Amino acid sequence: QVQLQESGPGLVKPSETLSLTCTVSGGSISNYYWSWIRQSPGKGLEWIGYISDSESTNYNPSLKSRVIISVDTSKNQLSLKLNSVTAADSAIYYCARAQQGKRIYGMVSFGEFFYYYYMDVWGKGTTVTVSSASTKGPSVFPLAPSSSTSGGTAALGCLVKDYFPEPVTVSWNSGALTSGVHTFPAVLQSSGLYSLSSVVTVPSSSLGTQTYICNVNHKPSNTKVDKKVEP
């Protein structure tokens, strides 16, 4: 019944302050704890810090010097700020609701209890790249149907030429068509820009004309591009 939404730039210059925001819709921030976890390619996920309901921070010793966590009272959102970032700090960033547990192995008065934490609810996760390279808006070229298998069946698609950085979101007819869609992961060319493709499998009897349009959005480029596809 709790939803977490990560929003941020997705691209930050090296040696600059990275900011992120995690909006909660399910419940008040001041009842449960919150924590930030990042997942860099080729490495395991890393717990960087958490914030309590009473607004008390605690950070991982390895990154303790550079990380500041905050929570807003007016808005159910928690902010993450990282200073002096490098290419290693670029990763998928998750915010999660952490619940506190008390584990008792002896009698409480002398001590003999330790607190443990666990994050039951996660957000979808936002990606962040760190590079000096500039933003590059995508170029959209349609992929005409080959006219492919003895019918039903035929295939069309859309090509997203080289862009930067990840990710690119692709919908079809503003989300009206969901069947047969398959958006492949992008390729990092030697140019330094990603390139992806998105295909739809439809019956040749559907043609025509069913007026298939694909919609492409690149958040860093601030550009939304719609392209019509036809034989």
Partner: protein, 211 residues
């Protein structure tokens, strides 16, 4: 540092040992993580599973010390394949910031699926832009290991070829794509272009030609 591998026959139960075993009484969390997706914790306290998790996953209570925290998965299937992390909290050690070393679970005996290849010629609008790209798309293939060789005519291209490493989709099959960058004049010169995809011992070839 890096991941430890585990292999299980399909439909047979499996136990996942936990590195850095505890010194005293412990509360362990078992997280299921898929690359690119949000981690899902299976067991927050060693017995205990959150709502929605199937009963097949289980962990060891430390009723009597000396027991080893393991993760048991019954009826192992494709969806179970993943990375599993063991978050350890014992009484002797201090605050445990890091999760365990990842454990890459692979399911053996999965039925192989032939790749579905679809080659797309460059768009006319791309040709007006003075660039050309042949796009070879490969979907629904297991095991996720393919090799892509481009041909013009007989000849292989060997230049301007960029291929993605296979990635798993929701179908639990892999998906890969290959891009051949060409100049529009080179696209018009040759009779046809061919994308050859080799999966296990089989090989599938698709051909496209200029209009």
């Amino acid at each position: 540092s890096y991941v430890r591998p585990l292999s299980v026959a399909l439909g047979e139960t499996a136990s996942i040992s936990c590195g850095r075993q505890a010194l005293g009484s412990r509360a362990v969390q078992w997280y299921q993580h898929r690359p690119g997706q949000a981690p899902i914790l299976l067991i927050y306290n060693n017995q205990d599973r959150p709502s929605g998790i199937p009963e097949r996953f289980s962990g060891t209570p430390d009723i009597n010390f000396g027991t080893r925290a393991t993760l048991t998965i019954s009826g192992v299937e494709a969806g179970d394949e993943a990375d599993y992390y063991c978050h350890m909290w014992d009484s002797r050690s201090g605050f445990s910031w890091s999760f365990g070393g990842a454990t890459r679970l692979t399911v053996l005996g999965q039925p192989k699926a032939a790749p579905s290849v679809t080659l797309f010629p460059p768009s006319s609008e791309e040709l007006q832009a003075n660039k050309a790209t042949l796009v070879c798309l490969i979907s629904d293939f297991y095991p996720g290991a393919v090799t892509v060789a481009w041909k013009a005519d007989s000849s292989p291209v060997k230049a301007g070829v960029e291929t993605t490493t296979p990635s798993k989709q929701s179908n639990n099959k892999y998906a890969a794509s290959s891009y051949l960058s060409l100049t529009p004049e080179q696209w018009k010169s040759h009779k046809s272009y061919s994308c050859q995809v080799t999966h296990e011992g089989s090989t599938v070839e698709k051909t496209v030609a200029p209009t």
